């Protein structure tokens, strides 16, 4: 139903719902289901309330949502403030990981803009 302030889909499966949780993907959903002792093919509509509470407890032993969002934000802000080379690449809005910039780089450089 409600997990970590966001509402998962009900007509779907458990791993897909936990991937719809920001901060959790497929293998982390495997970890959550294994810790909960719940079969995967069990659907959200037939999950009981105590099972959902255990899921909440297990993601709270993990971390999701605004905690990870502000962690990423503080990290990028820290790099851009201290002004390293990754800081200047994030600063300019360019690829940071050494990709070419002759061509491509479009996801970092935004949509194409002519003269």
């Amino acid at each position: 139903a409600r997990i970590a302030g966001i509402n998962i889909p009900d007509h779907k499966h458990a791993v897909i719902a936990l991937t719809s949780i920001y901060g959790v993907g497929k293998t982390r959903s495997k970890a959550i289901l294994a810790a909960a002792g719940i079969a995967e093919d069990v659907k959200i509509s037939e999950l009981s309330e105590g099972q959902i509470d255990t899921l909440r407890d297990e993601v709270a032993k993990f971390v999701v949502e605004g905690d990870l969002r502000r962690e990423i934000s503080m990290s990028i802000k820290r790099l851009m403030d201290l002004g390293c080379y990754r800081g200047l690449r994030h600063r300019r809005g360019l690829p940071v990981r050494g990709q070419r910039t002759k061509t491509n780089a479009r996801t970092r450089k935004g949509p194409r803009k002519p003269i």
């Binding site: 302030g5 966001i6 509402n7 949502e65 605004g66 969002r69 502000r70």
Partner: protein
């Protein structure tokens, strides 16, 4: 109602203690709590105003004013007297039941909640606040909503200054940060 009982039973004498007043009704009260939702896209579509008015009736337990434009403004393409907002005012036992609802359901349900700003007072003791997603409110259900919507809340009180208002709200344990 139980919040009013909490007020009348402990909050008045607590206020007496740390402020050293001369009157149990120098102890401030909550004058009114009004709920606004500006649905200014009604000029684009008046029907989403009706849906929004139904949603605000759902939260308030009370039929809302469909409030109109005071004076025509060029930049937003509105004419004077055009319905662009919804409002309710809450008094008495409705103060207390809705404030109970807020302080015991809604602020735990705020997405990425870190407490409210204590600098949100207007300089005269009255508090105001803005809610971005009414879906944090259980008065409306998830899959029957049409658009994401927000609203804003003002608690107008008889407190003469901001420290008075924040002391009253801290007595109600309003989550300042």
């Amino acid at each position: 109602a139980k919040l009013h009982d909490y007020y009348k039973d402990e909050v008045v004498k607590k206020l007496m203690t740390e402020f050293n007043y001369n009157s149990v009704m120098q102890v401030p009260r909550v004058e009114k709590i009004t709920l606004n939702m500006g649905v200014g896209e009604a000029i684009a579509d008046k029907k989403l105003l009706d849906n929004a008015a139904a949603d605000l009736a759902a939260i308030s337990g009370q039929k809302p004013l469909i409030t109109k434009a005071r004076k025509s403004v060029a930049g937003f393409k509105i004419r004077q007297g055009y319905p662009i907002g919804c409002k309710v005012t809450l008094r008495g036992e409705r103060m207390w039941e809705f404030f109970e609802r807020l302080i015991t359901i809604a602020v735990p349900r705020i997405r990425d909640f870190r407490g409210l700003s204590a600098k949100s007072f207007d300089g005269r003791g009255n508090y105001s606040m803005g809610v971005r997603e009414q879906i944090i409110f259980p008065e409306i259900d998830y899959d029957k909503v049409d658009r994401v919507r927000g609203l804003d809340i003002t608690i107008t009180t008889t407190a003469k200054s901001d420290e008075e208002g924040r002391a009253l709200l801290a007595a109600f344990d309003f989550p300042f940060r």
